[PDB]
Amino acid sequence: VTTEILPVSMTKTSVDCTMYICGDSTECSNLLLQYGSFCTQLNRALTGIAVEQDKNTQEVFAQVKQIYKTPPIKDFGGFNFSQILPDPSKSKRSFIEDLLFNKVTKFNGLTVLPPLLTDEMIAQYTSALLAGTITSGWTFGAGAALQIPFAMQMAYRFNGIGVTQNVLYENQKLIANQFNSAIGKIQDSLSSTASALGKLQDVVNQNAQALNTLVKQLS
Amino acid sequence: AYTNSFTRGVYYPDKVFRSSVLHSTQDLFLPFFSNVTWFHAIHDNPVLPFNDGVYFASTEKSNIIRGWIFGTTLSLLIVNNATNVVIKVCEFQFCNDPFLGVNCTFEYVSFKNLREFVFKNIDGYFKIYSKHTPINLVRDLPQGFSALEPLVDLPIGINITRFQTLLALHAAYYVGYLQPRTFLLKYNENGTITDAVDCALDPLSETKCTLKSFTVEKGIYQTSNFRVQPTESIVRFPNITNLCPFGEVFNATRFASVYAWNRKRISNCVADYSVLYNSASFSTFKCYGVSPTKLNDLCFTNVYADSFVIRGDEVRQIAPGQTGKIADYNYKLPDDFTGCVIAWNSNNLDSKNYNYLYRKPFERDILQSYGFQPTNVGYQPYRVVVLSFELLHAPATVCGPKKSTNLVKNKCVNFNFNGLTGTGVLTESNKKFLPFQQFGRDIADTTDAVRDPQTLEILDITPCSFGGVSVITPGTNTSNQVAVLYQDVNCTEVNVFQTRAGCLIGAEHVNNSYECDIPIGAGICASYQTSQSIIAYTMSLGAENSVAYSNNSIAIPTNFTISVTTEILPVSMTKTSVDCTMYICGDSTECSNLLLQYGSFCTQLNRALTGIAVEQDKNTQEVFAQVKQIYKTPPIKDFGGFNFSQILPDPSKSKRSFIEDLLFNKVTKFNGLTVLPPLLTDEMIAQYTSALLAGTITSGWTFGAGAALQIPFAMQMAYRFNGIGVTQNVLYENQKLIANQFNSAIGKIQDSLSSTASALGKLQDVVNQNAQALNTLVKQLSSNFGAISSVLNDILSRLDPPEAEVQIDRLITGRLQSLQTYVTQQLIRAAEIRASANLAATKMSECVLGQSKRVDFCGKGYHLMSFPQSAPHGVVFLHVTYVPAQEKNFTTAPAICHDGKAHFPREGVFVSNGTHWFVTQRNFYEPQIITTDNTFVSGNCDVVIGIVNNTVYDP
Amino acid sequence: EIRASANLAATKMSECVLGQSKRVDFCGKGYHLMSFPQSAPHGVVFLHV
Numbered sequence A: 001v002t003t004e005i006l007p008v009s010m011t012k013t014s015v016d017c018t019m020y021i022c023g024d025s026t027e028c029s030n031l032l033l034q035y036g037s038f039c040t041q042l043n044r045a046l047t048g049i050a051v052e053q054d055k056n057t058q059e060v061f062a063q064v065k066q067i068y069k070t071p072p073i074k075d076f077g078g079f080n081f082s083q084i085l086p087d088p089s090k091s092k093r094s095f096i097e098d099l100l101f102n103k104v105t106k107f108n109g110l111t112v113l114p115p116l117l118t119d120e121m122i123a124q125y126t127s128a129l130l131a132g133t134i135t136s137g138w139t140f141g142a143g144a145a146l147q148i149p150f151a152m153q154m155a156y157r158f159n160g161i162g163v164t165q166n167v168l169y170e171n172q173k174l175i176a177n178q179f180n181s182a183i184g185k186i187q188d189s190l191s192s193t194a195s196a197l198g199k200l201q202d203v204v205n206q207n208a209q210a211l212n213t214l215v216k217q218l219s
Numbered sequence B: 001a002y003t004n005s006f007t008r009g010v011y012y013p014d015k016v017f018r019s020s021v022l023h024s025t026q027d028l029f030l031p032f033f034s035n036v037t038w039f040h041a042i043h044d045n046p047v048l049p050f051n052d053g054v055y056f057a058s059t060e061k062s063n064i065i066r067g068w069i070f071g072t073t074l075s076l077l078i079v080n081n082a083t084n085v086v087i088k089v090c091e092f093q094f095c096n097d098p099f100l101g102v103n104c105t106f107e108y109v110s111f112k113n114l115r116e117f118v119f120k121n122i123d124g125y126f127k128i129y130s131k132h133t134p135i136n137l138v139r140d141l142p143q144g145f146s147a148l149e150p151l152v153d154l155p156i157g158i159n160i161t162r163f164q165t166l167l168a169l170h171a172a173y174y175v176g177y178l179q180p181r182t183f184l185l186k187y188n189e190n191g192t193i194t195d196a197v198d199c200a201l202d203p204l205s206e207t208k209c210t211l212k213s214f215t216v217e218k219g220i221y222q223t224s225n226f227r228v229q230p231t232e233s234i235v236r237f238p239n240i241t242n243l244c245p246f247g248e249v250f251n252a253t254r255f256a257s258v259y260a261w262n263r264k265r266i267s268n269c270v271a272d273y274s275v276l277y278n279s280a281s282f283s284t285f286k287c288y289g290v291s292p293t294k295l296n297d298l299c300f301t302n303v304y305a306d307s308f309v310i311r312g313d314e315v316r317q318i319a320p321g322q323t324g325k326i327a328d329y330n331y332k333l334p335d336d337f338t339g340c341v342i343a344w345n346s347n348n349l350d351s352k353n354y355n356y357l358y359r360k361p362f363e364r365d366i367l368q369s370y371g372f373q374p375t376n377v378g379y380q381p382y383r384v385v386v387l388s389f390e391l392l393h394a395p396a397t398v399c400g401p402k403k404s405t406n407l408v409k410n411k412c413v414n415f416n417f418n419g420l421t422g423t424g425v426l427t428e429s430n431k432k433f434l435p436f437q438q439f440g441r442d443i444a445d446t447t448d449a450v451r452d453p454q455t456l457e458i459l460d461i462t463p464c465s466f467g468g469v470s471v472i473t474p475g476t477n478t479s480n481q482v483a484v485l486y487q488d489v490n491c492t493e494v495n496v497f498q499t500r501a502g503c504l505i506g507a508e509h510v511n512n513s514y515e516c517d518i519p520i521g522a523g524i525c526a527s528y529q530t531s532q533s534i535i536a537y538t539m540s541l542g543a544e545n546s547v548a549y550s551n552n553s554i555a556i557p558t559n560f561t562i563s564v565t566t567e568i569l570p571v572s573m574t575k576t577s578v579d580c581t582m583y584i585c586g587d588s589t590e591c592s593n594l595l596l597q598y599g600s601f602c603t604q605l606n607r608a609l610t611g612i613a614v615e616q617d618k619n620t621q622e623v624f625a626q627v628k629q630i631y632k633t634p635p636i637k638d639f640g641g642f643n644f645s646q647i648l649p650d651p652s653k654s655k656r657s658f659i660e661d662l663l664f665n666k667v668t669k670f671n672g673l674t675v676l677p678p679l680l681t682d683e684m685i686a687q688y689t690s691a692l693l694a695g696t697i698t699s700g701w702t703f704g705a706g707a708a709l710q711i712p713f714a715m716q717m718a719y720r721f722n723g724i725g726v727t728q729n730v731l732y733e734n735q736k737l738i739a740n741q742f743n744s745a746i747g748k749i750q751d752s753l754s755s756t757a758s759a760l761g762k763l764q765d766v767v768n769q770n771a772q773a774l775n776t777l778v779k780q781l782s783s784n785f786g787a788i789s790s791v792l793n794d795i796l797s798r799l800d801p802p803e804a805e806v807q808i809d810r811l812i813t814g815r816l817q818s819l820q821t822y823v824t825q826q827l828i829r830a831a832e833i834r835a836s837a838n839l840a841a842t843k844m845s846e847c848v849l850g851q852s853k854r855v856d857f858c859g860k861g862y863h864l865m866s867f868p869q870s871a872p873h874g875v876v877f878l879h880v881t882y883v884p885a886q887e888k889n890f891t892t893a894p895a896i897c898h899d900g901k902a903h904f905p906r907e908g909v910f911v912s913n914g915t916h917w918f919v920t921q922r923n924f925y926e927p928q929i930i931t932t933d934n935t936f937v938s939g940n941c942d943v944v945i946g947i948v949n950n951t952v953y954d955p
Numbered sequence C: 001e002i003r004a005s006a007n008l009a010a011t012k013m014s015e016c017v018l019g020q021s022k023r024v025d026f027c028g029k030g031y032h033l034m035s036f037p038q039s040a041p042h043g044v045v046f047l048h049v
């Protein structure tokens, strides 16, 4: 099991160009208006950026029409998904998701808008996708989510790579064990290596630097 | 009595003709739906306030209302007696109740009817607007809209605070007040104002003004910014009762020599600088630091007075940036000097006199004498005092006689701490300043906290609550009801719902979730529903369901439908081209010569736009010109029951298909801005889509890989079915059904595209962004950017070159900057369009020329085939997919035992109907007898988990 | 850049999680069987099997 980390969205910042340039100043504002649309088109550009962040989030996560859940009996032929499925005792995020969230992190007209989809709503989308992937294979993608035994789903997955499905069944215990161990390795890496999520932290850092630069320029 | 003014009180703001335009202006207008006082002439001539201007209206039958008196004590007299209108500004004696029967600075002589007037007094001019119109109404003012025209403008210089009306005695009237509100004025085709929006009436009007439109589309818009206002001010200075000894500096018996100047320190005192500034005894009073009239508001940590005698011609040397016998050798100021240089003639004080001598900043380096004599101006003695101000934000000790106030905390206040001002809430602080620190600073170098000027305690300054204001609305075609979100604030200073996004007012909080309509944020969306009103709710992420999962149960489709979905992608943007010289310096030699001083700044923009225009043809060719030859369909449209008449070109028309015409019917100067044509016209694109359609229909994917080779359509579909894991016998056995579902799916495409304008929103948005970009660039031409006029010819016709060039440079910077902003936005937008074109081109090859194995790449289902259609600025793909329609629950197993051997399907799965086991294909239930020709053997029954007992037939 | 990344992530969600990929190195460095999405701050994390 390998981990690929991709940015989906950036901070939905919004900057009040008048408050930034002419903060509570009548004399400055009257002069700022002499520049016409130079100020307001920036408010518009930033609004456009903020809006497409929800579009980006929906395009990536909201690919399933229905919200699916796993059964009360986690029988997947020996395959242990307890670290990728939502934790009932918590916001219903998985154990691994909590590890991911624990690694990645004014009065000048600079404010930040919330996302339309909150961490809980995203967790529900990933839950639906995980439940779909685990119990119905790819059928929930093409159309209705149709149940299939996990061992048979894997048989399809093996034929899909040019490996006869008898290999899966004859070695099913081995395959399930390697899978379960691979997840344990994912846990050990993510919980100890901060750089593991550097691709998302870099986005946060660039946005923080951009905002800090804009404010510093006021001085 | 009072009435509703409705939409009355609008007038033409200037003397310029406009038509077919929405114009935004700020002036003194009657607020819409304002409260106006209703007067009568029955069985009433009070003195009324004038305030900032007066709206007057009357309804008449017998012309009783004839005039007005304007002034203070009650003087401007306006009377219309018979046909002679008389206007006077004379010391006329008025009665306590003036009426008509049925020293001068200015003089001029010239219900059934509604007469409207606007009276405003600006910069000494009394401006009168009016309108007359016939009416048929006694009860009250008629409801409706009309704009008033300027009639009279009186150059009087009169102070008007009150006014009185004049009635003829042997006619109701209304009085309102004007306010400096912004209105959006709608000018029709003939240049008549027919409507208006009061931008400060309500949140819907704010939205209409923000978008410069009288129609608002469904959605959420940011129109303004909420700010908590201060209630009172706070003025804080140290409680010092001693006054500063400026008199001891300026009224001194003797002054020092310039080589050995005196330095007197002023501290811990009240500094009254009005004496020094207002005094007429000074020959010069030049400030380099602060204006001389601000000296009693701001204050210093210290003040030093440098006192000495110089010649009159040496006065010019005491300044930052100067050099000379005094400036370099006797008395040097910093070039960043903050302070005031004050001097006066002392010819009758010092002259006789050789006791005055002359020879780094503020250096006192301890040699020639002056010969000061009473008969010498340039060689007469002058007494000069330089007041050096240390105005760094340190503890103040030298402050003017500004009246102090008490300290108010935990409220929004307008504060002044030793000359430092701002607006914010003062709160308790746990910060500790060092003994020499009076102010703290944040990252923006704004005040973070202060030490109170009188009390040794620290106050934190938290600027008053603010945030963006968004208006949530259904389209104005359905409802004018709105809800307002105050972003990132509590429901405090602002049917109220507190959300993480801010305080939402006017939307009902509903427990039931719905699919998101108008998004607010943080999981909250709003809609107009039930009678209807705006509601807010937590959005649904979709219906809840559950897969009937078990170790031995599989659901297999028993029926399917063929569906067609539409995907719309931009391919190109308008090939705009802007002449940067004509835009900035339109037909102007003087401006062009100045523009050339910027080198390549102008021409590289012409180049950037050219590059954008060129790649639009590249994008179009990459998407549509994927076939080397132009193919056509046969005269006999026999495709096995599949009807393509709506996607193929119409011979009676430009040879576009019926659907293409539907797509084209939905999606839509002299300033150096022109538009270039595309290389490929709508007809040429139609020929490319025709070739691709003909190829796709009659030769499948062979025209893509190489030569276009004919194949019967039914067989082509057989290939398409095998490509999705469905045995081709399904196609042939159900060919009539499949063709019918396909034909119906197209009919549904027709019904949607012809009735839903939003169906092609993805291409219309491109058109709208480009239109907005071009409109913004042109609108910027009207801006002054600090110039005396936004019109270049008006600068040139008014100023000589030494001054005109400066005003022009201001316009060049603004207009050149505008083009740079425009081009940058066009380049970034072009990158988005290019990326879309690249996606569209990929899809043309993988969806139309071939068959895709990529999920959700070519429609939401199992992809069979696609058919391209052209549209304005883009391509529309009709994706034909196979989607399971009906399914049944079967019992399953990974393998079957025969003689102890483990048998697995070569393809498909094993299923059980409750009594018998069958083998069948994954995507379509079609049970077959399990035989040695359907299964293979590997391993045995002691190895496979979940293996079941059955029999395998051996032919 | 973020939009392009989101477009890639969305493509991967459909081809790696909803389906099965035949594209080399698109859904992990090996022969792709299946994938499981996990959320993260400002993005998506894919566990590729």
Ligand SMILES: *[C@@H]1O[C@H](CO)[C@@H](O[C@@H]2O[C@H](CO)[C@@H](O)[C@H](O)[C@H]2NC(C)=O)[C@H](O)[C@H]1NC(C)=O
Pocket (backbone or CB within 6 Å): A080, A081, A082, A083
């Ligand atoms: C799936 O994996 C989890 C570990 O991630 C297993 O949980 C552990 O089970 C052992 C045995 O009962 C306990 O001693 C550990 O303390 C458990 N760990 C945690 C974190 O709970 C779980 O039992 C596995 N499930 C199956 C069916 O094998």
Ligand SMILES: *[C@@H]1O[C@H](CO)[C@@H](O[C@@H]2O[C@H](CO)[C@@H](O)[C@H](O)[C@H]2NC(C)=O)[C@H](O)[C@H]1NC(C)=O
Pocket (backbone or CB within 6 Å): A174, A177, A178
């Ligand atoms: C194929 O490789 C796997 C390991 O990836 C082998 O399984 C391991 O076998 C050793 C004994 O040699 C055990 O100690 C390990 O615990 C087993 N690992 C797991 C995950 O079960 C497997 O035996 C190898 N098969 C062949 C035919 O060589």
Ligand SMILES: *[C@@H]1O[C@H](CO)[C@@H](O[C@@H]2O[C@H](CO)[C@@H](O)[C@H](O)[C@H]2NC(C)=O)[C@H](O)[C@H]1NC(C)=O
Pocket (backbone or CB within 6 Å): B643, B644, B645, B646
């Ligand atoms: C293909 O579909 C078109 C409709 O899009 C059919 O045209 C209609 O045919 C009926 C029967 O003759 C006429 O009553 C309608 O007025 C026609 N409509 C139009 C818009 O022309 C066409 O006949 C179908 N072709 C085949 C072979 O089935």
Ligand SMILES: *[C@@H]1O[C@H](CO)[C@@H](O[C@@H]2O[C@H](CO)[C@@H](O)[C@H](O)[C@H]2NC(C)=O)[C@H](O)[C@H]1NC(C)=O
Pocket (backbone or CB within 6 Å): B559, B560, B561, B737, B740, B741, B885
């Ligand atoms: C599979 O579904 C199709 C519809 O998608 C069924 O065809 C319809 O059958 C009804 C009668 O039950 C007719 O009234 C419709 O006009 C038919 N539609 C079309 C497009 O022909 C089909 O019978 C179903 N097959 C099975 C085996 O259930």
Ligand SMILES: *[C@@H]1O[C@H](CO)[C@@H](O[C@@H]2O[C@H](CO)[C@@H](O)[C@H](O)[C@H]2NC(C)=O)[C@H](O)[C@H]1NC(C)=O
Pocket (backbone or CB within 6 Å): B913, B914, B915, B916
């Ligand atoms: C499972 O399928 C088998 C085969 O179609 C069914 O058995 C047949 O049932 C029909 C009556 O509907 C008889 O006329 C045939 O002679 C039977 N064939 C055999 C080989 O027995 C069986 O009934 C189906 N079982 C269920 C539960 O539907």
Ligand SMILES: *[C@@H]1O[C@H](CO)[C@@H](O[C@@H]2O[C@H](CO)[C@@H](O)[C@H](O)[C@H]2NC(C)=O)[C@H](O)[C@H]1NC(C)=O
Pocket (backbone or CB within 6 Å): B897, B947, B948, B949
């Ligand atoms: C499939 O059928 C075989 C018989 O052909 C079953 O084998 C029996 O297994 C039980 C339990 O171990 C033994 O007590 C019997 O003696 C075995 N029979 C014979 C003839 O040796 C086998 O268990 C069956 N499997 C399933 C899944 O039903």
Ligand SMILES: *[C@@H]1O[C@H](CO)[C@@H](O)[C@H](O)[C@H]1NC(C)=O
Pocket (backbone or CB within 6 Å): B002, B003, B004, B034, B035, B036
């Ligand atoms: C005007 O204000 C008075 C006093 O509050 C009120 O009685 C009257 O109804 C108001 N009239 C209108 C038209 O708002």
Ligand SMILES: *[C@@H]1O[C@H](CO)[C@@H](O)[C@H](O)[C@H]1NC(C)=O
Pocket (backbone or CB within 6 Å): B081, B082, B083, B084, B086
């Ligand atoms: C109108 O009034 C003026 C005085 O203001 C007077 O001179 C004039 O004759 C009057 N006109 C008529 C028609 O009575």
Ligand SMILES: *[C@@H]1O[C@H](CO)[C@@H](O)[C@H](O)[C@H]1NC(C)=O
Pocket (backbone or CB within 6 Å): B091, B103
């Ligand atoms: C006219 O104005 C002058 C102003 O100096 C004043 O002295 C004079 O008395 C005024 N006359 C009348 C009749 O008001």
Ligand SMILES: *[C@@H]1O[C@H](CO)[C@@H](O)[C@H](O)[C@H]1NC(C)=O
Pocket (backbone or CB within 6 Å): B188, B189, B190
């Ligand atoms: C403009 O005036 C003409 C009469 O000359 C009239 O017919 C037309 O309707 C007017 N247009 C508008 C928009 O009122």
Ligand SMILES: *[C@@H]1O[C@H](CO)[C@@H](O)[C@H](O)[C@H]1NC(C)=O
Pocket (backbone or CB within 6 Å): B360, B363, B365
């Ligand atoms: C200070 O004295 C030195 C000689 O020791 C001299 O060179 C220097 O110019 C003097 N500085 C000033 C400001 O006069």
Ligand SMILES: *[C@@H]1O[C@H](CO)[C@@H](O)[C@H](O)[C@H]1NC(C)=O
Pocket (backbone or CB within 6 Å): B238, B239, B240, B453, B454, B455
């Ligand atoms: C202000 O007045 C108080 C007495 O009420 C005094 O203790 C305090 O020192 C004064 N502050 C200053 C800065 O002089």
Ligand SMILES: *[C@@H]1O[C@H](CO)[C@@H](O)[C@H](O)[C@H]1NC(C)=O
Pocket (backbone or CB within 6 Å): B477
């Ligand atoms: C919008 O309003 C106009 C005028 O009443 C009406 O003709 C049109 O059908 C309306 N459109 C919709 C979508 O309601």
Ligand SMILES: *[C@@H]1O[C@H](CO)[C@@H](O)[C@H](O)[C@H]1NC(C)=O
Pocket (backbone or CB within 6 Å): B489, B490, B491, B498
């Ligand atoms: C608003 O203020 C109240 C205290 O009056 C507080 O309990 C509540 O949590 C605050 N809400 C928000 C969104 O700040």
Ligand SMILES: *[C@@H]1O[C@H](CO)[C@@H](O)[C@H](O)[C@H]1NC(C)=O
Pocket (backbone or CB within 6 Å): B509, B510, B511
């Ligand atoms: C939702 O229902 C609960 C009772 O279960 C009630 O207390 C709450 O006020 C309701 N909220 C809304 C917005 O209807």
Ligand SMILES: *[C@@H]1O[C@H](CO)[C@@H](O)[C@H](O)[C@H]1NC(C)=O
Pocket (backbone or CB within 6 Å): B548, B555, B887, B888, B889
């Ligand atoms: C299979 O059985 C479950 C449980 O009764 C039911 O919810 C599900 O809809 C059934 N599926 C089909 C395809 O009949």
